[PDB]
Amino acid sequence: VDTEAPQVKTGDYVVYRGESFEFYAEITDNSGQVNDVVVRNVELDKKTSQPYLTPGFIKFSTDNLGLPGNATVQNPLRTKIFGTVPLNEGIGYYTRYVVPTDSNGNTTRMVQNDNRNGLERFIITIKTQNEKYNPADPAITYVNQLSNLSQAERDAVAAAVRTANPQIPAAARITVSANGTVTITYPDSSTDTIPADRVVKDLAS
Ligand SMILES: [Ca+2]
Ligand SMILES: [Co+2]
């Protein structure tokens, strides 16, 4: 009789506010068949005494559930853990559980122990949006006075930064100070800076 639960491999997951993500847990069972997979908090929801998963932005799906041979060591079952992080999501980390059930009623046991991290237990770390990008230097804007850029010069720098950084979000804001220092404000309000020496130079005749 099958008394062995499915085994799971996950990882150490990093996600970023305002950005989408997807990870795949790998699941196998000695019987070769997994009937269900739930990604969940270890504790039940106070409001329903039923399983749940917080933060609410974490979603999951598993194709090919309940079919013979869907979870063998050779061809594992894969559970996708995906979503988009809200711009105001709390910065920090969580440990959550991938909990499959095989064809014989055996369910992987949730065990709160760091030695299970990366197996059925996984860490997900939520970082600010600026941590996903590394702003590129723009083409130099040449200005009449390095201590006092005009509005049009500040406007040209921002356009140059935008041109040099197509990979940053369209909703990221580029502001330029009076000495040409660039601030990039991402949609989640975190920031990056490009120092003036890589942005502006004095205009020669
Ligand atoms: Ca089994
Ligand atoms: Co001059």
Numbering used by the authors: 256 to 460
Provide the authors' original text about this structure.
Many streptococci adhere to protein-attached carbohydrates expressed on cell surfaces using Siglec-like binding regions (SLBRs). Siglec-like binding regions (SLBRs) are among the streptococcal adhesive modules that bind sialoglycans. SLBRs contain two adjacent modules: a Siglec domain, which shares some features with mammalian Siglecs, and a Unique domain13 with no close homologs outside of the family. The conserved sialic acid-recognition motif governs general specificity while sequence diversity in surrounding loop regions allows the SLBR to select between related sialoglycans.
To understand selectivity of these SLBRs for human glycans, we chose comparators from each branch for detailed study. From the first branch of the tree (blue in Fig. 2), we selected the SLBRs of the Hsa adhesin from S. gordonii strain Challis (termed SLBRHsa) and the equivalent SLBRs from Streptococcus sanguinis strain SK678 (SLBRSK678) and Streptococcus gordonii strain UB10712 (SLBRUB10712; see footnote). Although these three SLBRs are >80% identical in amino acid sequence, when they were tested with arrays containing 49 sialoglycans, they exhibited distinct binding profiles. In comparison, SLBRUB10712 and SLBRSK678 were more narrowly selective, although both bound to multiple sialoglycan ligands. Specifically, SLBRUB10712 bound strongly to 3’-sialyl-N-acetyllactosamine (3’sLn; Neu5Acα2-3Galβ1-4GlcNAcβ, Fig. 1b) and a small range of related structures, while SLBRSK678 bound to only two of the glycans on this array, 3’sLn and 6-O-sulfo-sialyl Lewis X (6S-sLeX; Neu5Acα2-3Galβ1-4(Fucα1-3)GlcNAc6Sβ, Fig. 1c). To reveal how similar SLBRs could include or exclude different sialoglycans, we determined crystal structures of these five SLBRs at resolutions between 1.0 Å and 1.7 Å. We then evaluated selectivity conferred by the FG loop where crystallographic analysis would suggest that the β-branching of SLBRHsaD356 excludes C3 fucosylation, while the larger, unbranched Gln of SLBRUB10712 and SLBRSK678 can bind fucosylated ligands. All three of these variants exhibited a substantial increase in binding for 6S-sLeX.
